Amino acid sequence: DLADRFAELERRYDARLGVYVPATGTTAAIEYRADERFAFCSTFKAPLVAAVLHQNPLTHLDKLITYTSDDIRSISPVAQQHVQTGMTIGQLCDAAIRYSDGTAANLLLADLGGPGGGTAAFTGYLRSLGDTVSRLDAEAPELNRDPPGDERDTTTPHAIALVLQQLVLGNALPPDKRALLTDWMARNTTGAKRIRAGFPADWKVIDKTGTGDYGRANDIAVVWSPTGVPYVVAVMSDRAGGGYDAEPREALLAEAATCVAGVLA
Ligand SMILES: *C(=O)[C@@H](NC(=O)[C@H](O)c1ccccc1)[C@@H]1NC(C(=O)O)=C(CSc2nnnn2C)CS1
């Protein structure tokens, strides 16, 4: 029983775990706390890049964005390095997805524009995909810091999986922009120990991770079986019981993913 296994993992890691895999032709939806809110953390950067792609001609990726010392306020492995030269929108999308770059994401929110530094337009984009649940209220670093239970900067495993399904597998984006998003997620450097670790090597995994305070660790993926059957996998967790400084536990997501992969194989 999957629910028993998921509950066991919660006890093991003193965590709250959320899992959603949307139904397919022959598989029923997999759901565990799937309609409970969890912080986005960096997982928002996948639909964010899609919003930026959608909003602009493809050649907007070649526009150089300049930024300064006071723009670096969060983990920004790429943007810290190019602060002196600037970065193109294309480079920013790359950094945001593949390195979970916080400054890159903040700059992409600014590019999207409008109230709240782009957070309202981001949320508006999710609404256009029929997501009436998720909300983004702050940028990095604030978005990772909301108290457990607080609805600011949250999604649910159910909501984000349906968003990702439309972006990667559905028609939310034209094929050319869809490929850009897909490729970036395919080349992600941060997800080796999460959903990827739970699926056999002959399954293709593309993903976007999130990590935050109160032991928050998320991963949203699209996976393909060895015969090219796709599934969307959203795993979210927090550890409120350790307080603000609770260590995120990647191993929990790898184990949850292993359990999911066992059902889907
Ligand atoms: C997006 O979630 C973003 N998270 C943060 O900036 C958090 O505030 C945070 C910082 C330090 C430690 C924990 C949380 C960034 N995204 C991610 C991610 O997606 O995983 C991380 C995880 S750390 C990482 N990245 N690659 N390899 N490791 C390990 C922190 S920055």
109 CA to centre of ligand 1 in angstroms: 18
We report the CATH number of the domain holding residue 40 as: 3.40.710.10
- Resolution of the PDB structure in angstroms: 2.0
Distances (CA, A) of 240 to 29, 153, 159, 258: 27, 16, 22, 24
- Catalytic site residue from 8, 128, 142, 247: 142
Q: Is 134 a catalytic residue?
A: no
Range of the domain at 24: 1-265
Strand runs (DSSP E) across 83-229, as ranges? 87-88, 154-155, 204-211, 217-224
25 CA to centre of ligand 1 in angstroms: 35
Q: Is 142 a catalytic residue?
A: yes
3-state secondary structure of 53: helix
Q: Report the b/e string of 85-104 with b at 16+ CB within 10 A.
A: eebebbbbbbbbbbbbbbbb
Are the C-beta atoms of 256 and 19 separated by less than 8 Å? Answer: yes
Number of domains in the chain: 1
Name the residue of 160, 209, 214, 237 whose CB sits within 8 Å of the most ligand 1 atoms, as the mutation to test its pocket.
209
210 CA to centre of ligand 1 in angstroms: 6
CA distance 174 to 228: 21
